[PDB]
Structure formats: structure tokens, C-alpha cells
Amino acid sequence: WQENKSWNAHFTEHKSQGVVVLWNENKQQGFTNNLKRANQAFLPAATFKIPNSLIALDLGVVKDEHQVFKWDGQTRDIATWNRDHNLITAMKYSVVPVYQEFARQIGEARMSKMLHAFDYGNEDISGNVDSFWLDGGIRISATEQISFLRKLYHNKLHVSERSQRIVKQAMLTEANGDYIIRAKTGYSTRIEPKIGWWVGWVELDDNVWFFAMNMDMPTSDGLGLRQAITKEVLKQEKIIP
Amino acid sequence: WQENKSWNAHFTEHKSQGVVVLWNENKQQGFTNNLKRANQAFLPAATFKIPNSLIALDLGVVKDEHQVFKWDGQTRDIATWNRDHNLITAMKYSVVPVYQEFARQIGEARMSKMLHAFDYGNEDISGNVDSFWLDGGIRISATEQISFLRKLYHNKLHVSERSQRIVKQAMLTEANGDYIIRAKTGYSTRIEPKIGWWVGWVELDDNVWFFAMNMDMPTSDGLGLRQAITKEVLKQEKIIP
Ligand SMILES: [Cl-]
Ligand code: NA
Ligand code: NA
Numbered sequence: 035w036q037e038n039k040s041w042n043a044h045f046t047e048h049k050s051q052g053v054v055v056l057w058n059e060n061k062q063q064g065f066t067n068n069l070k071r072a073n074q075a076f077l078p079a080a081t082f083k084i085p086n087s088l089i090a091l092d093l094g095v096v097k098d099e100h101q102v103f104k105w106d107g108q109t110r111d112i113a114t115w116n117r118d119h120n121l122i123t124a125m126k127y128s129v130v131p132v133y134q135e136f137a138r139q140i141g142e143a144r145m146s147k148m149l150h151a152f153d154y155g156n157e158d159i160s161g162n163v164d165s166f167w168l169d170g171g172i173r174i175s176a177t178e179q180i181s182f183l184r185k186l187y188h189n190k191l192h193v194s195e196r197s198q199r200i201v202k203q204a205m206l207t208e209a210n211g212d213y214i215i216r217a218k219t220g221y222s223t224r225i226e227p228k229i230g231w232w233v234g235w236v237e238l239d240d241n242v243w244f245f246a247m248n249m250d251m252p253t254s255d256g257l258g259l260r261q262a263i264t265k266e267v268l269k270q271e272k273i274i275p
Numbered sequence: 276w277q278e279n280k281s282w283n284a285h286f287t288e289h290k291s292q293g294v295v296v297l298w299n300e301n302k303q304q305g306f307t308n309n310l311k312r313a314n315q316a317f318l319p320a321a322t323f324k325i326p327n328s329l330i331a332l333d334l335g336v337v338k339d340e341h342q343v344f345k346w347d348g349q350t351r352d353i354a355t356w357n358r359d360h361n362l363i364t365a366m367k368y369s370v371v372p373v374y375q376e377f378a379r380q381i382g383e384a385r386m387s388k389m390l391h392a393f394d395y396g397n398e399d400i401s402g403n404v405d406s407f408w409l410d411g412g413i414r415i416s417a418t419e420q421i422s423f424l425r426k427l428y429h430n431k432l433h434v435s436e437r438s439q440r441i442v443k444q445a446m447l448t449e450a451n452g453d454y455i456i457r458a459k460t461g462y463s464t465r466i467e468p469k470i471g472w473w474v475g476w477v478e479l480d481d482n483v484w485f486f487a488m489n490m491d492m493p494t495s496d497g498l499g500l501r502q503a504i505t506k507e508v509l510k511q512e513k514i515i516p
Pocket of ligand 1: 203
């Protein structure tokens with residue numbers, strides 16, 4: 035592990051505060067602009083959709099990435115939510131109500147057992163089984179997110195290889211000739227302090243760079259900063275053009 | 276099926292000739308600018324990397340997408356070929372020597388049997404074990420490519436679901452918030468007429484559009500047209516922005 039304070043400039047150019055954590059898989063070395071924040075545990079919010087997806091698939095709650103989950107008919111504030119979705123779109127649009135139904139079906143006993151198996155954050159599911167990742171007791175740090183992701187990347191999680199592959203497919207966010215990004219955004223607004231998350235990895239031709247970032251998010255206006263800052267760090271480090 | 280000759284404009288604008296075939300999965304409808312050419316069988320060239328990959332994986336020739344195939348030390352014309360590769364990179368850069376090795380390991384009996392199971396093209400492997408797809412008897416049409424691709428998308432091909440999933444991952448070409456493209460390029464140069472191919476699918480939020488195209492390609496200089504012309508068709512059909 036190494037601290038590289040220079041990345042703070044990317045946060046400060048925006049009158050922002052946060053942490054970005056990178057892990058060079060080939061070299062087995064990590065980097066961050068704030069080792070302490072890197073280790074600070076927060077509510078995962080939508081980043082919980084990764085483990086939630088894995089558990090639902092492994093248990094058969096979700097058959098495959100094509101099964102459609104009908105809109106429940108309640109008009110919510112995010113337009114994209116008011117439609118039918120499959121696993122790929124539910125993740126893409128961070129569709130809470132679909133994931134809430136997955137959690138309810140999985141149930142508290144299975145959820146807790148799986149999180150323990152996953153070694154995920156504090157492994158705590160107190161609160162509602164369908165909202166703990168939002169207003170409950172689960173907590174996870176950026177380094178912890180990296181550890182979880184590495185296991186997923188290597189198919190080492192305690193679920194089927196198939197489930198892991200489907201989830202990794204679902205995580206696809208951007209791709210071109212230069213790189214592939216598999217990731218998940220997060221936005222915690224129920225319990226202070228409000229924060230934004232971006233976690234995942236960058237696949238290159240001969241390496242993979244895992245990343246986990248979070249930043250203070252007082253308002254929604256700064257949401258795009260989650261990707262923008264992470265990318266600036268990635269550019270500075272020559273990981274992406 | 277239905278013919279739409281307006282697409283010819285895209286080809287003519289470049290002093291080019293070819294065919295683009297599209298299949299709307301949701302509607303179960305096909306479209307092409309040239310029905311006859313859509314059904315004409317040509318050497319698959321590098322598009323053969325899709326079946327080749329599936330077979331190698333299913334038979335254990337290739338253990339996973341991470342296994343490294345060391346450069347043989349011979350300096351070839353394509354710089355990207357002169358390095359170690361894995362299944363993802365080999366597919367991405369169309370690294371023939373890697374695929375040739377797979378082909379030799381697989382052998383003629385297994386290859387023929389697998390192609391018969393896949394219902395792939397004319398199913399004829401007559402020619403060199405490590406080059407039939409380049410200068411042998413195998414032939415496949417654009418419509419035939421789409422038939423094959425649909426099975427692959429649905430995990431219906433005779434081989435393991437795992438094998439199909441890995442190959443679809445390897446096929447990843449481009450992605451963003453609007454669409455995902457899984458595809459493979461090809462350039463048949465050994466037997467006239469020389470042609471360029473691009474086959475795959477475009478994954479949308481609510482549908483998938485399969486595609487198969489080929490065009491006359493006298494020189495490698497026009498290789499970029501394969502993607503560019505395809506994209507014009509997609510834009511014209513409102514599939515992509
Ligand atoms: Cl993928
Ligand atoms: Na596994
Ligand atoms: Na024909």
C-alpha cells in the first residue's frame with residue numbers, strides 16, 4: 035500500500051473531498067490519496083447491488099439476466115424506474131424497488147449467512163432486510179470493496195462460477211479498444227454523511243486495476259463527479275488515455 | 276424477412292459493395308439490403324474465431340480466459356501479434372497463430388464433429404487442419420452467421436453454458452450508456468473475392484439486434500468501413516444514436 039497525496043488535486047479542483055483507491059493486480063500494490071479514508075466504512079447504497087445480485091442468482095431468486103421483473107405500477111421519482119427491467123437494466127439504472135423484492139425473497143437468514151460467507155464489510159444486516167444497505171447497519175470501506183471485488187474477479191466468492199460471471203457481465207459500464215470498465219455507482223442519502231460511490235475495475239490487455247472511490251455528496255449535482263474524478267486519477271496514472 | 280435497398284447508399288458512398296443483415300430479436304424480423312448476397316456463403320476467416328474459441332474451451336484446450344499463450348518468438352507483420360496473449364486479447368487482435376495452435380490441438384475429427392453439432396455453415400472442414408477457415412472448404416452466409424449467433428446468445432449451442440459465456444465476454448467490442456456491441460471482425464484474403472466481415476449483436480435495454488455483414492475488400496486500407504458502414508445502417512434504423 036502507498037499513499038499518493040497528489041490525487042487530492044482532482045478532488046480540490048472541484049471543491050470536493052473523498053478517497054480513490056487503486057489496486058494493481060499484477061504488482062499486488064495499492065494506492066490511495068488518503069489511507070485513513072480508504073479504510074473508513076460507510077453505507078454501500080447501490081454498490082450493494084453487486085452482492086445482492088450474486089445471492090439472488092445463486093438462490094434462484096433470479097433465474098438469469100433475461101428474466102423480466104415487471105414494474106409494480108407505483109410511479110416513483112426516477113423515470114427509468116417506472117418500467118419493466120431485467121438484471122442488466124436494474125443494475126444499470128440502480129432500480130431499488132427491483133432489488134428490494136430480491137432481498138425480501140432471499141430473506142434475512144440467507145442474506146446474513148451469505149454476507150458472512152462473502153466476508154463483506156461488517157457483515158451486518160440490521161434494519162429491514164429490504165433496506166439495510168440504505169438505512170441499516172451494514173458498513174463497508176473502500177479497501178473492503180476492493181477485497182470483495184478481487185474475489186469476484188477471480189471467481190473466488192462462495193457462490194457458483196456462473197453467478198459470478200453473470201454479475202460481472204451486469205457490471206459492464208464502458209468499453210472500447212483501450213479499456214473495459216466493470217463497475218457500480220452508489221449514492222447514500224438516508225444517513226449522514228451523504229456520499230457517492232464508484233467501485234469496480236478496469237481491464238486492460240495485460241493487467242487489471244481495481245478501484246473504489248467515495249466522496250462527500252451534499253447534493254445530487256455532484257453525482258457526475260464520481261466518474262469524472264476517478265477517470266482523472268486513472269488518466270494521470272496512465273491507466274486510460 | 277424483408278429487403279431494404281436504401282442501405283446501399285451507405286455502401287456506394289464509399290465506392291463499396293456488400294451486405295448488411297439485421298435481426299430484430301423481439302419482433303423476430305430480419306432485414307437486409309440484398310437478399311441474395313445475405314444468403315451467399317463465403318470463407319469465414321477470423322469470424323471463425325468464435326466457434327474455434329467455443330470448441331477449444333469446451334474441450335479443455337483452453338482452461339479459461341486468462342490462460343497465457345506465449346509468443347512463439349517469430350516476428351510477424353502485425354505488431355500486436357508479437358507478444359503473449361490470452362483468449363480475450365487473441366480474439367481482440369485476431370491473432371491467427373494462437374488460433375492455429377488451438378485448431379491443431381482440437382484435431383480434425385473433433386472439429387468436424389463440433390461443427391456438425393453447431394450446424395455451422397456448410398460444416399465442411401476439408402483443407403488444412405490449421406487453416407480451413409482461411410483457405411479450405413468451409414463456407415458460411417451472413418444469415419447463417421446470424422442463426423449461429425442467436426444460438427450462442429441463448430446458450431443453446433451444444434457446448435457448456437460456461438463456454439458460451441466466456442466467448443460472449445471475449446466478443447465484447449464496445450460499450451456505453453446507449454448500447455453494447457459483442458462482435459467479431461474478419462478478413463478473407465486467400466480466395467477471391469476478398470471480403471471483410473463484421474458479425475455480432477447490439478444489446479439494447481429492451482431488445483437485441485443481431486447483425487452480419489460482409490463487403491468486398493481489395494485492400495486492408497478499407498477495413499474500417501466494416502464498422503463504419505454497419506454503424507450508418509444502425510443509425511438509420513434508430514438502433515443506435
Ligand atoms: Cl461482458
Ligand atoms: Na468458482
Ligand atoms: Na448460398
